[PDB]
Amino acid sequence: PNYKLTYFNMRGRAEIIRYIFAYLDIQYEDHRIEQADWPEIKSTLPFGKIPILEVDGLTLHQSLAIARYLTKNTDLAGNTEMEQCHVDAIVDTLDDFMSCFPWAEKKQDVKEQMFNELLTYNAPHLMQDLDTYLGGREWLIGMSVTWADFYWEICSTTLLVFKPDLLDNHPRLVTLRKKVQAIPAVANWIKRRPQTKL
Amino acid sequence: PNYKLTYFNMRGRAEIIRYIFAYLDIQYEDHRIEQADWPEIKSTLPFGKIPILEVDGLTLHQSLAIARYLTKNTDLAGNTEMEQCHVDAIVDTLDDFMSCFPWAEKKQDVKEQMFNELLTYNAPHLMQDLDTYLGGREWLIGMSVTWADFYWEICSTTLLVFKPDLLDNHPRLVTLRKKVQAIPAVANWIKRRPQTKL
Ligand SMILES: c1ccc(C(OC2CCN(CCCc3nnn[nH]3)CC2)c2ccccc2)cc1
Ligand SMILES: c1ccc(C(OC2CCN(CCCc3nnn[nH]3)CC2)c2ccccc2)cc1
Ligand SMILES: N[C@@H](CCC(=O)N[C@@H](CS)C(=O)NCC(=O)O)C(=O)O
Ligand SMILES: N[C@@H](CCC(=O)N[C@@H](CS)C(=O)NCC(=O)O)C(=O)O
Ligand SMILES: [Mg+2]
């Protein structure tokens, strides 16, 4: 079908969807809006948030709901219902953390303090839990790559911008990142995608 | 299989799982732990959070990941691939808001202030979007109840404790709550479950 992804000109929450389209070799319109155009767009969306994915004109929302929709019946989903649950759980654990950052905090005072606290205190704890969860395994779930591995690489890439030494004590997590980045379709997207901070 | 759900003695994040077990008429061990017994259990979990659901000796985590797992191949999941996406999206939209509340706040005074601001300044926009989304339909997604309807009833039940007039401008959302509460299996669970504040 005809796919149209709408988001800001950032990797952000739309990147997981972009990785899936690239991996599955699916053509889509990568619509990146300008902040000045958001207000009008927002008023037309059922829940006023992006990303959204239009499939033949029908609008879908929530980045992870869309990602799950696109990976169902593909080799990125998980090989059993239980493994699919593990994929979803890891994705939500990562998303829970990313969602904790108060980008909308009214007071720039508290906002700055919270970011530093999450990066210096919480981040290291999560990295340790993920490292232990992965153990000596090749991928986070099963014996093959899943979109949970994609989300790990995506989330860690942005966190590394704020805290470069995040994975100094976890080489196995770095290796996993490199494995995802080395996947042909993914590597090709990473090299051609717009270069943005977030 | 044999199911063992572990959570605190409260509805909270485990309630969606409990509703699903009730609706599907599935037996399970509803393990409710006292605060004092949490520390020693927490240290044994990969990510140190509850609820967790043990299925034939294997542990699953993340409430919504578990809920999705339990509804797969059942009438609660959504009738089409697209509708299953909408179910996931509505659930995440609700969970996104619930996750905004600062339960970790130290000052009880400040904590209540933040809760009241979220319920007064932010909740109204979400309630309006949900009402508009529902329109004059019987259920949020499709023509039959889904676990998204369950989650709406569960989330709104607790929010109403803090903001009694939350739905005074949205009778259609109240009607939906009543419909969920009237389903025999669900009604039975609501009447027999332990009475807790949250
Ligand atoms: C997966 C999930 C979430 C993220 C986060 O980045 C998103 C949401 C925040 N967004 C903020 C830019 C705000 C802004 N205002 N003016 N200029 N820039 C960018 C995209 C996220 C969460 C935690 C730490 C960093 C980034 C990324 C991936
Ligand atoms: C679905 C999603 C999230 C919730 C929230 O309730 C949880 C979060 C924190 N938990 C803290 C209680 C600690 C405590 N111990 N003894 N007394 N108090 C209770 C359950 C939630 C989020 C937003 C508003 C209200 C409730 C419920 C359902
Ligand atoms: N959990 C949702 C988050 C949706 C969200 O908050 N999107 C932000 C951009 S990253 C947005 O639309 N904010 C603009 C606004 O709230 O006005 C997802 O993963 O899609
Ligand atoms: N998004 C996760 C949240 C998990 C979570 O934060 N659980 C809380 C209880 S509601 C917990 O384990 N907190 C106790 C602690 O962190 O020690 C879910 O839905 O399962
Ligand atoms: Mg979430």
- Provide the 3-class DSSP secondary structure of residue B52: strand
Alpha carbons A184 and A186: distance in angstroms, whole number: 5
Of A6, A15, A20, whose CA–CA distance to A48 is shortest? A6
User: In chain A, what are the domains?
Assistant: 1-74+183-198 (3.40.30.10), 75-182 (1.20.1050.10)
> Cβ B132–A46 below 8 Å, yes or no?
yes
- Provide the 3-class DSSP secondary structure of residue B151: helix
B16, B88, B105, B106: best to mutate for the A interface, most A CBs within 10 A: B88
In contact, B131 and B125? CB cutoff 8 Å:
no
How many residues in chain B? 198
3-state secondary structure chain A: CCEEEEEECCCHHHHHHHHHHHHCCCCCEEEEECHHHHHHHHCCCCCCCCCEEEECCEEEECHHHHHHHHHCCCCCCCCCHHHHHHHHHHHHHHHHHHHCCCCCCCCHHHHHHHHHHHHHHHHHHHHHHHHHHHCCCCCCCCCCCCHHHHHHHHHHHHHHHHCCCCCCCCHHHHHHHHHHHCCHHHHHHHHHCCCCCC
Of B81, B90, B98, whose CA–CA distance to B139 is shortest? B90
In contact, A54 and A60? CB cutoff 8 Å:
yes
Alpha carbons A186 and A173: distance in angstroms, whole number: 18
The β-bridge partners of A33 are A8
Alpha carbons A126 and A122: distance in angstroms, whole number: 6
Identity at A45, one-letter amino acid code: L
In contact, A51 and A14? CB cutoff 8 Å:
yes
- Provide the 3-class DSSP secondary structure of residue B31: strand
| Distance from Cα A94 to the centre of ligand 5, integer Å | 9
Resolution in A: 1.5
| Distance from Cα B12 to the centre of ligand 2, integer Å | 5
With CA atoms as reference, the chain B residue closest to A47 would be B129
The answer for residues whose C-beta is within 8 angstroms of residue B53's C-beta and 6 or more apart is: B3, B4, B5, B6, B17, B59, B60, B61, B66
Q: How many CB atoms lie within 10 A of CB A24?
A: 13
The answer for residues whose C-beta is within 8 angstroms of residue A116's C-beta and 6 or more apart is: none
From the CA of A151, give the closest atom in ligand 1: 1
Paired tokens of B2: 């044999």
Paired tokens of B12: 């909270």
The answer for residues whose C-beta is within 8 angstroms of residue A183's C-beta and 6 or more apart is: A23, A145
Alpha carbons A93 and A89: distance in angstroms, whole number: 6
Is B63 labeled as ligand-binding? yes
In contact, B166 and B159? CB cutoff 8 Å:
yes
